[PDB]
Amino acid sequence: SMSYTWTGALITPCAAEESKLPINALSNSLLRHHNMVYATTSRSAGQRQKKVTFDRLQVLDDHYRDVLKEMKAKASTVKAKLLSVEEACKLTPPHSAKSKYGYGAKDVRNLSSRAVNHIHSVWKDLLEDTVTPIDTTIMAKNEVFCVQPRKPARLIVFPDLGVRVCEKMALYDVVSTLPQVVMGSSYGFQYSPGQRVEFLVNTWKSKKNPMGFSYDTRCFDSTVTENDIRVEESIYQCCDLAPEARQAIKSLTERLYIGGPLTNSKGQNCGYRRCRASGVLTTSCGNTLTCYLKASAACRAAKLQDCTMLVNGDDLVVICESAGVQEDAASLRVFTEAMTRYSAPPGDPPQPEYDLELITSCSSNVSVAHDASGKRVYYLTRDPTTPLARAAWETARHTPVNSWLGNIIMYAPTLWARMILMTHFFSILLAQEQLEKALDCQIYGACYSIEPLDLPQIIERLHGLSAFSLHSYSPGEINRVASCLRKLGVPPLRVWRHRARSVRARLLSQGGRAATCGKYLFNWAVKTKLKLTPIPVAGYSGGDIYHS
């Protein structure tokens, strides 16, 4: 079974595409080496098509079926509800792609009679027809990166707006509640970053002689087979469901999730999909369940002892009891052989690690700093190259997703988010008097509208109060940041400290919520520190989900 078949019609853009970093009067203050930053476009879509197109063979053994049966037993305890049209409508992002049938996301959100009527007709059709493949649009994503001695565009596959609202009706409650019940503490999207870090540290310490590894499947969405998507459905069907929900889920599975025709932005047939669609409601939950199933079975095949898995989408980490360096290495090759039999070979082979900090997953690693009292605090960080490249782009261009804001929220304890992103963007917001303006950003795939003035409260909840007083960062973390700054031609950390003092003073001058940002976000910038006191579920990547 080929992941895709192609007609030769091109994957076309829906608008003008920029590959070159836009420059304005603020650009050079952040980043001087402009030619290092680029955006992917549909021009590289052909390259990605080649990468994502391959045959999938699957060999399923008793370990696989044993794990599945256990997963189904837990799924059978879940009771999920149907969302009303209105509930589903309110989960639709304001800027979500408009329907081909004469309405858009704002119409959906307002419960306009044209939108609601069409949605009712799509629902009725799902109930009555379980065979006809549902159309999807295929597009090239425009994403910004730094060059490394260029990545081709990622592809997004999604159905019409009316269908997307129907998916929410049938499955939003399922994808929100089932993964945690089936996978327990292994379901990664249940955690805030602070909770995630705590869970990783505690898990590592729970082993007598800990060993851990990341496993990254090559082109995971393309590795997902018809079997995998039917197995996912069978898990969902274990739930206590409304009869209408059961029918819609079956219909969606047969008609959309298993596969279907691919249409470009110009309406031309591009080919056919027999793998995971990247832009459906079930992408995150389906990938997580499938990765967990295959990985759990593979742990058993490799006889890994006292495994604790952490899984979110296609990202996987296993922490377990070491049997010794030589035996661990052998056991990972067996793990990999099993995963490969299940259709999920790795991009690069997994490596056993005997220090938590040497494991990288979702581009991130655990590092250590110290709070106000000198106590060790663990936090998740990453290489700041991509965040800074996207910050540079967003300095010069308004974009639908404000990666900078998401990065500040999710990487708030990091030296680079605090010193560079907070300083740079608060300066911009001050200049435009836009501190109070809500902005769109992404947390675990779901879209959120967030006012920058609420960052202190948000950071405290996701990371704890220590996120505003961390110091004595590791030499390795400091060196990675500094090295990234030289690479991109970003001013050194000393310059950012100086700018932050100014930004802080400006925020304090404003009083109110602005002053609170000054006090908490920039306490690191001042010599004599002000005493800081407390301030008064699931993943949905590609799921077209919104919250305010």
Ligand X SMILES: CNC(=O)c1c(-c2ccc(F)cc2)oc2cc(N(c3ccc(B(O)O)cc3)S(C)(=O)=O)c(C3CC3)cc12
Tokens of 187: 């379901």
C-alpha–C-alpha distance, residues 399 and 442, integer Å: 12
Contact call for residue 317 and ligand X (CB under 6 A): yes
Question: Of 238-277, which residues contact ligand X (CB under 6 A)?
Answer: none
Contact call for residue 366 and ligand X (CB under 6 A): yes
Contact call for residue 441 and ligand X (CB under 6 A): no
Residue 181 Cα distances to 63, 80, 173, angstroms: 20, 12, 13
Contacts of 78 (CB under 8 A, 6+ apart): 174, 177, 178, 181, 182, 238, 239, 240
* Cα torsion 437, 441, 447, 453: sign: negative
Of positions 103, 444, 520, 546, contacts ligand X by CB under 6 A: 444
User: How many CB atoms are located within 10 Å of the residue 155 CB?
Assistant: 23
Nearest Cα residue to 177 out of 81, 298, 66, 251: 81
Nearest-approach distance from CB 353 to ligand X, in angstroms: 8
Of positions 52, 82, 200, 453, contacts ligand X by CB under 6 A: 200
Contact call for residue 426 and ligand X (CB under 6 A): no
Nearer to ligand X, 173 or 315 (CB): 315
Nearer to ligand X, 193 or 384 (CB): 193
Of positions 3, 296, 308, 312, contacts ligand X by CB under 6 A: 312
Strands 446-450, 439-443: pairing is: antiparallel
* Cα torsion 106, 108, 112, 113: sign: positive
Of positions 362, 435, 438, 535, contacts ligand X by CB under 6 A: 362
Residue 365 Cα distances to 129, 149, 182, 213, 378, angstroms: 47, 23, 26, 12, 10
Nearest-approach distance from CB 145 to ligand X, in angstroms: 12
Strands 546-547, 269-273: pairing is: unpaired
Nearer to ligand X, 278 or 364 (CB): 364
DSSP per-residue codes, 201-269: HHHHHHSSSEEEEEEEBTTHHHH--HHHHHHHHHHHHTSB--HHHHHHHHHHIIIIIS-EEEE-TTS-E
C-alpha–C-alpha distance, residues 235 and 179, integer Å: 10
Whether the CB-CB separation of 404 and 438 falls below 8 Å is answered with: no
* Annotated binding-site residue numbers for Mg(2+): 216, 314-315
Of positions 310, 467, 484, 488, contacts ligand X by CB under 6 A: 310
* Binding segment toward ligand X, per CB under 6 A, in 17-25, 189-197, 223-231, 501-509: 189-197
Nearer to ligand X, 196 or 255 (CB): 196
Nearest-approach distance from CB 455 to ligand X, in angstroms: 15
Whether the CB-CB separation of 472 and 395 falls below 8 Å is answered with: no
Contact call for residue 217 and ligand X (CB under 6 A): no
Of positions 282, 364, 367, 466, contacts ligand X by CB under 6 A: 364
Contact call for residue 315 and ligand X (CB under 6 A): yes
Nearer to ligand X, 395 or 407 (CB): 407
* Binding segment toward ligand X, per CB under 6 A, in 36-44, 53-61, 295-303, 362-370: 362-370
Nearest Cα residue to 321 out of 286, 350, 354: 354
Phi and psi at residue 138, in whole multiples of 5°?
-110, 130
CA diameter of the chain: 69
* Binding segment toward ligand X, per CB under 6 A, in 103-111, 277-285, 330-338, 361-369: 361-369
Of positions 93, 179, 193, 260, contacts ligand X by CB under 6 A: 193
Q: How many positions of this chain bind ligand X (CB under 6 A)?
A: 23
Tokens of 508: 């304090």
Nearest-approach distance from CB 494 to ligand X, in angstroms: 26
Contact call for residue 380 and ligand X (CB under 6 A): yes
Contact call for residue 196 and ligand X (CB under 6 A): yes
Contact call for residue 210 and ligand X (CB under 6 A): no
Of positions 283, 361, 402, 427, contacts ligand X by CB under 6 A: 361
Nearer to ligand X, 104 or 210 (CB): 210
Of positions 3, 42, 222, 365, contacts ligand X by CB under 6 A: 365
**Kind and range of the H or E run holding 306:** strand 305-312
Strands, E, within 424-469: which ranges? 439-443, 446-450
Nearer to ligand X, 119 or 462 (CB): 462
**Residues at the site binding ligand X, with contacts judged by CB under 6 A:** 188-189, 193, 196, 200, 310-312, 315-317, 356, 359, 361-366, 380, 410-411, 444
